[PDB]
Design an enzyme around this catalytic site. Structure first.
Site, mmCIF file in Angstrom:
data_model
loop_
_atom_site.group_PDB
_atom_site.id
_atom_site.type_symbol
_atom_site.label_atom_id
_atom_site.label_comp_id
_atom_site.label_asym_id
_atom_site.label_seq_id
_atom_site.Cartn_x
_atom_site.Cartn_y
_atom_site.Cartn_z
ATOM 1 N N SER A 1 -6.306 1.063 -4.329
ATOM 2 C CA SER A 1 -6.490 2.444 -3.881
ATOM 3 C C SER A 1 -5.176 3.212 -3.888
ATOM 4 C CB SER A 1 -7.091 2.464 -2.478
ATOM 5 O OG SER A 1 -7.081 3.772 -1.945
ATOM 6 N N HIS B 1 -15.785 1.207 -3.789
ATOM 7 C CA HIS B 1 -14.389 1.114 -3.405
ATOM 8 C C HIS B 1 -13.962 -0.250 -2.879
ATOM 9 C CE1 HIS B 1 -10.713 3.346 -3.209
ATOM 10 N NE2 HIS B 1 -10.518 3.083 -1.930
ATOM 11 N N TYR C 1 0.876 -1.183 0.000
ATOM 12 C CA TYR C 1 0.000 0.000 0.000
ATOM 13 C C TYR C 1 0.908 1.227 0.000
ATOM 14 C CZ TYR C 1 -3.987 2.950 1.478
ATOM 15 O OH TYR C 1 -5.013 3.877 1.573
ATOM 16 N N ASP D 1 -17.807 3.642 -7.224
ATOM 17 C CA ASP D 1 -16.695 3.974 -6.348
ATOM 18 C C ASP D 1 -16.682 5.486 -6.228
ATOM 19 O OD1 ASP D 1 -14.356 4.477 -5.033
ATOM 20 O OD2 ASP D 1 -13.091 3.187 -6.273
#
Ligand SMILES: O=C([C@@H]1CCCN1C(=O)CCCN1C(=O)NC(c2ccccc2)(c2ccccc2)C1=O)N1CCCC1
Length: 708
Positions: A552, A678, A471, A639
């Site tokens: 993301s 999302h 991430y 999203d």
């Protein structure tokens, strides 16, 4: 065997950014409602779907996945009033169900089944809060995966549905006042256009309201608003004694908040309007997270001058900083994840020790260590135990452990925790796989933690397919979690699993966070690129067979790395990612991410962003023997967290700049799912479909044979 769609390029979409001119030829894809955007989405999926189902591994996977993923998924038990509740998914249910039982021994009955709300499971529960006496219940409902929420209410005893309904709710709190008269919550101003998750309109002026049960929303009381600061958001909660309303004011995603409070006994006639807020902490210099209070002495978890956090007590009768008492000093290494107060005077501190969790029982009065709870290597993803509770529950999870829920009766001399429930996923033999944690230096020498998983006895010859995940941002720590989907990669695809705890996250405190944001953002891409080189040099895998994934903020990560080092990977799966770093702040809640990336509106920030923005840095390698990695972008129409235009423009750009090259044989694709957002609240069926797509992509691109 397939050709990409012709996509009109608006060569007149030139904008000036501090003297610099940038062209956004697919800016028209920013209108979700246009016929052009719809025709583009329909066209792209017309090439992706077929390609994915054409892989014989897709069905093998989906089958395997369906069997292995079919296990009981329980949540921690938690007591509200005189009843017990817990979520339970029999196995393959679209959404988990809320059960209720009057006794730990008694028979449980269904309380709330979101599954009877939508045939496909795209209506999910998003937020709930019980009244102090546990006699009334409130919950948020989200449709198609949008962040937008609809708060409904229920009468616990008898599970009776009430008529109260609250709309225009988003990123809201849910605090009932102890008299049971009403609840605090957040809403946005009624705006023009749609408000169903498909819109890109910016969310500003979130206000704080108070809703009195038995009334209509038009009657709600406005309790706090910041007309001078459109971006601020104020969440509220009541102190354990129900006497104070604590309001945490936030701006962005930084671990810092303002702290105002209201003494409910000081309100002339209760909540009739804007409260008499006392601006205790009127700045954004540090985070102050409420734990508990004894009279006017409040205990807070803070990061003020403490990057790894600590506990401090503040006396509202003597607020001067020069008077705060440090209850539990900051650890030099361990990060204090969260704190809970249980059994009146016990504190449950959960630390992160080298990306692993640990639970300890501390004393409220002095803050001394009373007990450590044995925990294998992994993380605690569940916990229940309020100040009024005389017992605690917590759930442990790891890479090969689906989850163990432990119990502990705190009313006993010997605080011995016992196993309450233990889940096992047959078809998988933990004894066959080995988990190892290494530390590798980054471009600047900073040692970075990384987890490694694979079958035992494998020969490190770089012949194995590797799956590197990460991430890298917003103070988010990627700790050990169970993942059937990923284990099937190891077992049935002979692959190696690895997770890099690159900078930008919170595995090592704010300092770690700040080491990968704003100007140091490139640090995140270097750390992650170094983790790929490590796996390649140590013999785990080879570039041609290395796949990287991120979602993301992590989609920006992998999308950016593919641009900076395409020679280093052979497959890239970016999920609902950020691609336009020049306008991300212009849509919905994007203005909130500037505390991590910055804003292109500033000439100083623009300079960092223009250097990594995925959309503006796509370029075909000059080297003949080098082409872009196979790429699959996953997004969805609802999203509203990270608008789909990011992926839409990015893909159009890829296929044009790179896909159009002769030497490019690796496919650049996209799949826009429908009725999903999302990721939170995604039904079990849609999720089984997703992973089957991702791994069908890898197997088909890297040419991986299935292993029975
Ligand atoms: O979704 C995201 C990022 C990461 C996780 C939260 N997030 C968000 O964008 C969170 C958006 C909504 N939100 C705020 O703008 N402030 C928060 C907040 C959340 C986490 C940490 C600090 C503040 C808030 C405000 C008031 C009261 C309580 C909370 C909140 O929930 N991203 C997608 C693109 C990259 C970043």
């Amino acid at each position: 065997s397939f050709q990409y769609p012709d996509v009109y390029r608006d060569e007149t979409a030139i904008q000036d950014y501090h003297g610099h001119k940038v062209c956004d030829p697919y800016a028209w894809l920013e209108d979700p409602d246009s016929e052009q955007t719809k025709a583009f989405v329909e066209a792209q999926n017309k090439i992706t779907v077929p390609f994915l189902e054409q892989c014989p591994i897709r069905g093998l996977y989906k089958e395997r996945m369906t069997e292995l993923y079919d296990y009981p998924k329980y949540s921690c038990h938690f007591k509200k009033g005189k009843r017990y509740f817990y979520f339970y998914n029999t196995g393959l249910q679209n959404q988990r169900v809320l059960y209720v039982q009057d006794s730990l021994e008694g028979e449980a009955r269904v309380f709330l089944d979101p599954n009877i709300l939508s045939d496909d499971g795209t209506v999910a529960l998003r937020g709930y809060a019980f009244s102090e006496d546990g006699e009334y219940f409130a919950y948020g409902l989200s449709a198609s995966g949008s962040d937008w929420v609809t708060i409904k209410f229920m009468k616990v005893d008898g599970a009776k549905e009430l008529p109260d309904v609250l709309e225009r709710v988003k990123f809201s709190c849910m605090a009932w006042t102890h008299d049971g008269k009403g609840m605090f919550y957040n809403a946005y101003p009624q705006q023009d256009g749609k408000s169903d998750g498909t819109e890109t309109s910016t969310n500003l002026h979130q206000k704080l309201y108070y809703h009195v049960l038995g009334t209509d929303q038009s009657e709600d009381i406005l309790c706090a608003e910041f007309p001078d600061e459109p971006k601020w958001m104020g969440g509220a909660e009541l102190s354990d004694d129900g006497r104070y309303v604590l309001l945490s004011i936030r701006e962005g995603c930084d671990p810092v908040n303002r702290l105002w409070y209201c003494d409910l006994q000081q309100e002339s006639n209760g909540i009739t309007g804007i409260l008499k807020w006392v601006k205790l902490i009127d700045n954004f210099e540090g985070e102050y997270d409420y734990v508990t209070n004894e009279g006017t002495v409040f205990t807070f978890k803070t990061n003020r001058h403490s990057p790894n956090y600590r506990l401090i007590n503040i006396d509202f009768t003597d607020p001067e900083e020069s008077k705060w008492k440090v209850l539990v000093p900051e650890h030099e290494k361990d990060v204090l994840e969260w704190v809970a107060c249980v059994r009146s005077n016990f504190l449950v501190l959960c630390y992160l020790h080298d990306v692993k969790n640990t639970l300890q029982l501390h004393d409220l009065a002095t803050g001394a260590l009373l007990k450590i709870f044995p925990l294998e290597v992994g993380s605690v993803v569940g916990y229940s135990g309020q100040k009024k509770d005389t017992e605690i529950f917590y759930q442990f999870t790891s890479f090969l452990s689906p989850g163990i829920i432990y119990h502990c009766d705190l009313t006993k001399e010997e605080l011995e925790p016992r196993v309450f429930r233990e889940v096992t996923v047959k078809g998988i033999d933990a004894s066959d796989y080995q988990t190892v944690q290494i530390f590798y230096p980054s471009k600047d020498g900073t040692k970075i933690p990384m987890f490694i998983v694979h079958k035992k006895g494998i020969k490190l010859d770089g012949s194995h397919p590797a799956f590197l995940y990460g991430y890298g941002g917003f103070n988010i720590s990627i700790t050990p979690n169970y993942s059937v989907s990923r284990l099937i990669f190891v077992r049935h695809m002979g692959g190696v699993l690895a997770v890099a705890n690159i900078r930008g996250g919170g595995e090592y405190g704010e300092t770690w966070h700040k080491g990968g944001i704003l100007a140091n953002k490139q640090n995140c891409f270097d750390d992650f690129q170094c983790a790929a080189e490590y796996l390649i040099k140590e013999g785990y895998t080879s570039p041609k067979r290395l796949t990287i994934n991120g979602g993301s903020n992590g989609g920006l990560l992998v999308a950016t790395c593919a641009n900076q080092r395409p020679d280093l990977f052979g497959c890239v799966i970016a999920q609902v990612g950020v691609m336009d770093m020049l306008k991300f702040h212009k849509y919905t809640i994007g203005h909130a991410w500037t505390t991590d990336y910055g804003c292109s509106d500033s000439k100083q920030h623009f300079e960092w962003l223009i250097k990594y923005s995925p959309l503006h840095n796509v370029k075909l390698p000059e080297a003949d023997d080098i082409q872009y990695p196979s790429m699959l972008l996953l997004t969805a129409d609802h999203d509203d967290r990270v608008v789909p235009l990011h992926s839409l423009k990015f893909i159009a750009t890829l296929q044009y700049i790179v896909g159009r090259s002769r030497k490019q044989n690796n496919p650049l694709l996209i799949h826009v799912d429908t009725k999903a957002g999302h990721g939170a609240g995604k039904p079990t069926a849609k999720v089984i479909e997703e992973v089957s797509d991702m791994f069908a992509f890898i197997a088909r691109c890297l040419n991986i044979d299935w292993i029975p």
